Structures are given as C-alpha cells and as structure tokens.
Design an enzyme around this catalytic site. Sequence first.
Site, mmCIF file in Angstrom:
data_model
loop_
_atom_site.group_PDB
_atom_site.id
_atom_site.type_symbol
_atom_site.label_atom_id
_atom_site.label_comp_id
_atom_site.label_asym_id
_atom_site.label_seq_id
_atom_site.Cartn_x
_atom_site.Cartn_y
_atom_site.Cartn_z
ATOM 1 N N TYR A 15 0.820 -1.209 0.000
ATOM 2 C CA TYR A 15 0.000 0.000 0.000
ATOM 3 C C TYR A 15 0.867 1.278 0.000
ATOM 4 C CZ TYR A 15 -4.019 -3.078 1.008
ATOM 5 O OH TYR A 15 -5.001 -4.041 0.951
ATOM 6 N N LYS A 33 5.210 4.769 6.272
ATOM 7 C CA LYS A 33 4.510 4.240 5.105
ATOM 8 C C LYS A 33 3.480 5.232 4.537
ATOM 9 C CE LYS A 33 2.504 0.131 3.052
ATOM 10 N NZ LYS A 33 2.681 -1.346 3.073
ATOM 11 N N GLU A 77 7.635 1.053 14.050
ATOM 12 C CA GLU A 77 8.956 0.929 14.689
ATOM 13 C C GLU A 77 9.926 0.442 13.600
ATOM 14 O OE1 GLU A 77 10.215 -2.796 17.119
ATOM 15 O OE2 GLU A 77 8.040 -3.090 17.038
ATOM 16 N N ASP A 123 -0.828 -12.078 3.599
ATOM 17 C CA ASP A 123 0.340 -11.986 2.724
ATOM 18 C C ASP A 123 1.669 -12.176 3.470
ATOM 19 O OD1 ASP A 123 1.296 -11.633 0.053
ATOM 20 O OD2 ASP A 123 1.524 -9.452 0.319
ATOM 21 N N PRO A 126 9.046 -13.515 3.397
ATOM 22 C CA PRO A 126 10.310 -13.068 4.023
ATOM 23 C C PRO A 126 10.488 -11.560 4.063
ATOM 24 C CG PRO A 126 10.694 -15.061 2.749
ATOM 25 C CD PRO A 126 9.300 -14.601 2.427
ATOM 26 N N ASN A 128 8.268 -9.175 4.464
ATOM 27 C CA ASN A 128 7.560 -8.519 5.569
ATOM 28 C C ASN A 128 7.801 -9.150 6.941
ATOM 29 O OD1 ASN A 128 5.433 -10.586 5.493
ATOM 30 N ND2 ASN A 128 4.266 -9.308 4.055
ATOM 31 N N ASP A 141 3.214 -5.516 7.870
ATOM 32 C CA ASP A 141 2.189 -5.441 6.805
ATOM 33 C C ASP A 141 0.834 -6.026 7.255
ATOM 34 O OD1 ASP A 141 3.939 -4.332 4.375
ATOM 35 O OD2 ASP A 141 1.944 -4.787 3.582
HETATM 36 C C1 LIG Z 1 17.046 -1.871 6.348
HETATM 37 C C2 LIG Z 1 15.612 -1.677 6.835
HETATM 38 C C3 LIG Z 1 14.915 -3.019 7.057
HETATM 39 C C4 LIG Z 1 13.396 -2.841 7.115
HETATM 40 O O1 LIG Z 1 12.699 -3.191 6.162
HETATM 41 N N1 LIG Z 1 12.970 -2.285 8.255
HETATM 42 C C5 LIG Z 1 11.732 -2.004 8.694
HETATM 43 N N2 LIG Z 1 11.539 -1.539 9.926
HETATM 44 N N3 LIG Z 1 10.335 -1.387 10.156
HETATM 45 C C6 LIG Z 1 9.608 -1.721 9.091
HETATM 46 C C7 LIG Z 1 8.233 -1.744 8.869
HETATM 47 C C8 LIG Z 1 7.705 -2.171 7.646
HETATM 48 C C9 LIG Z 1 6.316 -2.148 7.532
HETATM 49 C C10 LIG Z 1 5.665 -1.675 6.388
HETATM 50 C C11 LIG Z 1 4.271 -1.733 6.328
HETATM 51 C C12 LIG Z 1 3.536 -2.180 7.427
HETATM 52 O O2 LIG Z 1 2.180 -2.193 7.394
HETATM 53 C C13 LIG Z 1 4.186 -2.610 8.578
HETATM 54 C C14 LIG Z 1 5.573 -2.571 8.637
HETATM 55 C C15 LIG Z 1 8.588 -2.592 6.619
HETATM 56 C C16 LIG Z 1 8.164 -3.109 5.381
HETATM 57 C C17 LIG Z 1 8.503 -2.489 4.165
HETATM 58 C C18 LIG Z 1 8.083 -3.032 2.936
HETATM 59 C C19 LIG Z 1 7.339 -4.216 2.925
HETATM 60 C C20 LIG Z 1 7.018 -4.856 4.132
HETATM 61 C C21 LIG Z 1 7.432 -4.308 5.349
HETATM 62 C C22 LIG Z 1 9.969 -2.567 6.866
HETATM 63 C C23 LIG Z 1 10.481 -2.142 8.096
#
Ligand SMILES: CCCC(=O)Nc1n[nH]c2cc(-c3ccc(O)cc3)c(-c3ccccc3)cc12
Length: 285
Positions: A15, A33, A77, A123, A126, A128, A141
Amino acid sequence: MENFQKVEKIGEGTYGVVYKARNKLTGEVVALKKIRTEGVPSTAIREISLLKELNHPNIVKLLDVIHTENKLYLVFEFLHQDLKKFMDASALTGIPLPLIKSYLFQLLQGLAFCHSHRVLHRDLKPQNLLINTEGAIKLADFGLARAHEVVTLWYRAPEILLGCKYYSTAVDIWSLGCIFAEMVTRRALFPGDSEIDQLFRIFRTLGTPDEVVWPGVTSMPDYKPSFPKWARQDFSKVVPPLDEDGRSLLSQMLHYDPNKRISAKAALAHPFFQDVTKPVPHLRL
Ligand SMILES: CCCC(=O)Nc1n[nH]c2cc(-c3ccc(O)cc3)c(-c3ccccc3)cc12
C-alpha cells in the site's frame, strides 16, 4: 508530515512506499509508510485504528496513524533487516537450525495472538518479516490487507488460489510453512510465476488434491476437474536435512484441507519445539 525527515527508501510495500524516517520531537528513527484517491474511507480508518491496540513482541509496532490533507501516513517501529536479505546473506552456509527454530516459534506466537483477535495476515513473506540484533523476528504489513511491482504468489495458500472468498487463519499457517522449508533448504518451496504455475508447483510436490485428502475441493470456485493428476512426493525428498520432528510439523502446516491444517496454538506444542533456544543472529548492517 512536518515532524519527520526522510533519510532513505526502506522499500516498496503493498500500500505505497516505505521510508526510513527521523522524528524531530523525539529524535527517534522510524519506518514511515505513505498509503496510496477520492478522500479516504471511514471503514479503513477504524480497521487501521484497531491495529494500534493489536500489540505483541512479534508484531512490528504501529507507533502512530497520521491522516493529513487527504493522504494517510503509517508510522512503524524501525527494524534493521528483513528475512529476505538475511536468507540471501546466509545462502553459503544457511541459517543454523537453532535460529530457524526460534524464528518459527516466535512467528507462531505472533500468529496465535492475531488469530485469537480474528486478525489474518493474508500476505506472509520473508520481505515482511523483520529482524533485530536481539534474536527477535516480527510480523509487518499486518491487517493492512483488510483495509507497479509484481506481487509474489510463492507463499499463497491453495484455497486462496482455488478462489475461496472467505479465507480462514489457516492461510497464514500455509505461508509460514513455505518460509520454514525455504529457511531449511535455502530455496523457495513453490516459486510460481503465475496463479496456475503456483498451483501446479504445489500439485507436483504434495499431489493433486481430490475428495480423499480434501473433502469439498472439487466444488471450489476455480477448481477444474481437468487439472492434471500428480502423485504426492515424500517430505524426505522435499526438505532434506530437516529432522523428523520438523518434517512432521511442516507436513501439518502444509495440509491441503484448511480444517485439518495445524493451528498456530497446536504448532507451538509440537515436539519440534522441545529444544527451543533464543540464538542471536550474525547480521551485517
Ligand atoms: C534496512 C531496513 C529493514 C526494514 O525493512 N525495516 C523495517 N523496519 N520497520 C519496518 C516496517 C515495515 C512495515 C511496512 C508496512 C507495514 O504495514 C508494517 C511494517 C517494513 C516493510 C517495508 C516493505 C514491505 C514490508 C514491510 C519494513 C520495516
């Protein structure tokens, strides 16, 4: 939002885009996000606001929800590494079994909590799944699915693929099973590049589902009596060198019938989790 500064692009979520951001008032580093227009629905606001109260040590903390000037911002976070990159950095030697096992146990704890509140991931992948220096793994996610890069079909449960409009909790168990096999073998279990290719890869490995192993499979929306009939392959050929307890647990997470498929609660009681420890990963930042 006025209180944040973008430091870099974390990645591209389902999203919208995800960014690494610094706060001004706290100085904290966060995952921001930018969600997706007309004027933002009310129903989605309530579903997102319900997620703030859905806190567990194995769920990425939704710190704040920001709805401003007809644009939504989700403040999470920040965690330093995702499981897709970690698996890529562990390709030569493979993630050690004690760490694979701890990750699975914690993810099952995370799932058992969501499923107790009638909340599905839908969904799991790895990508997420996020990891820290302390040995913790967390689900990201979450609940977003309820409220142009290519979407991975690799972890999709067969009932979703067969057109079931009412997913159960068992879809999350199937996704986690695929991740588990992948953590063990260092290769995706079912790397499908289309819905039928994905379905056919599951059929080649676990056999074509019939009324015998899955009562009510032939009556499913996208089920075709014309599907080829593949015989099941033994799990010893599927996931070497996972031991017997692991194979038996994986087998239960990969059951065709979602009703016969193991719950996140019963899986936590499986003998595979007899010798569970909390190893810390060797991650490079
Ligand atoms: C080098 C950074 C590594 C990383 O991805 N760190 C993240 N820290 N926190 C994070 C939080 C989220 C996230 C995105 C959407 C959501 O609804 C919930 C969580 C994501 C994230 C980003 C893209 C796809 C899936 C998860 C990545 C990180």
